[PDB]
Amino acid sequence: HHHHHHTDPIRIELPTLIAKLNAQSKLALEQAASLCIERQHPEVTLEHYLDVLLDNPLSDVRLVLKQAGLEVDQVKQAIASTYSREQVLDTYPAFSPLLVELLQEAWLLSSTELEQAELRSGAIFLAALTRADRYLSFKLISLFEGINRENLKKHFAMILSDSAET
To answer: What is the DSSP letter of 10?
Structure first.
């Protein structure tokens, strides 16, 4: 059309996604940002979020890892090896663009196939695993190869029944 511009797929505003987050799920992001400052990293990534979630034995992420037989220590070490060295931070670390896209996809999956009213780490992790090539560092793709995505989506609420985020 001569009076309508080209458009690309609708993107949801970050503040609107942030408001969907479960409470327990949302403190972890703030702490992932704190973990960022501590590490001198310039932006909050999925890996920071997974790192902080590994500290809570009842996060959805820990429950998925337990069901897959993955030891927390192995996962922690893997995440740490993916981290940059220290950088000079000019600005306060915000969520990386890739992580914001992840929240959007995980909210779309939450609100449809997962029948979730809030955005939880389990949905964020299932979306990341489903699109591992896009969202996960190379070593974690290898590490997480045995997690069965179809089964986690199919039995999501049952698997995560004991979660702090339920």
So the answer is: -
